[PDB]
């Protein structure tokens with residue numbers, strides 16, 4: 001099998017910058033290599049074939065080069081919508097092989113989250129469970145601490161988090177923290193609060209609500 | 214321009230045949246290959262068939278596991294995976310190409326190997342510049358798709374990767390932000406589809 005070792009593994013850079021991904025073949029593969037870009041929630045899309053040639057509709061700010069065992073993809077005016085994972089591909093000798101990939105995040109100014117809290121539906125409660133959701137919206141960077149509290153006692157072990165890939169337009173992230181309790185547990189307490197700590201905030205902001213009002 | 218057979222939940226040791234067909238042309242008069250995406254996101258060339266010389270080309274790693282055939286008559290390509298194990302759980306794409314012209318991948322087929330049974334999600338309203346959403350809880354297997362107002366609403370929509378909760382059931386919420394003024398003027402319906410369990414539900418999200 002021909003190995004394609006690609007680097008860097010991960011890279012963060014500002015809009016308008018120039019960066020380059022690289023691939024190392026383990027055997028001169030001529031110029032039989034392609035470059036692929038895969039945006040969040042989509043199949044990969046070929047950018048380049050034959051190391052330096054572009055496919056229609058692929059912006060000129062993409063260029064490929066190199067040969068033998070040394071290949072490079074360069075992006076020259078990094079745009080937000082550029083946020084993706086990039087892969088090189090060798091197709092000079094079967095079996096075709098892909099590089100491990102390069103995840104390109106974009107550096108943007110800090111931006112504080114917008115915090116919203118959601119009580120469980122009166123319809124979900126009926127069935128036995130209670131999920132209290134806390135949404136942190138459009139922030140940067142991706143690092144954020146969320147603390148759940150109920151009647152002012154801090155919680156652990158009954159929450160889960162999820163974060164979206166960087167938004168292609170505003171380069172922000174969004175996160176959700178979900179508190180899962182049993183119906184009984186939920187009706188035991190009154191005050192339900194979600195506290196958010198983020199470097200874009202001078203001091204942690206709290207969004208809470210009282211049960212039944 | 215490519216369609217692929219729906220998502221799949223296949224019991225270990227059992228098998229699965231994935232289909233792939235084009236809408237306005239025959240994929241069978243172009244080269245066709247399949248690619249597997251697994252542990253996180255990472256690609257493996259399975260094998261391919263050339264339209265001008267009998268015989269599918271296979272990668273050894275999948276010799277014995279993958280069988281590739283076509284049916285030039287119906288313009289359909291097939292991939293048969295036998296003896297499935299949890300390491301066959303992945304997104305499988307069929308791709309088409311011709312010389313240096315195009316090279317286009319299909320949407321993807323999620324494939325989960327597991328003895329569990331399919332379970333559609335419960336969809337709960339996440340009641341309300343303001344945010345609203347839908348909790349899509351307790352479904353199996355992945356994936357599920359959510360959309361707002363039948364597709365009409367796309368700005369500010371944020372759908373979160375699903376989390377595998379301890380019960381072995383998947384869970385995620387979709388959110389959207391809108392103008393608060395709009396809360397007494399516009400109806401907001403989230404539409405959830407979970408192909409595997411033939412579960413399709415519309416949920417009105419309104420101010421509680």
Ligand SMILES: C[N+]1(Cc2ccc(C(=O)NCCO)cc2)CCCCC1
Pocket residue numbers: 034049050091096244245246260261262263264270310312313316
């Ligand atoms: C698709 N590709 C590379 C490539 C991809 C898949 C195969 C392949 O699997 N061929 C089997 C015989 O038809 C061969 C080559 C074509 C040439 C440009 C770069 C992209």
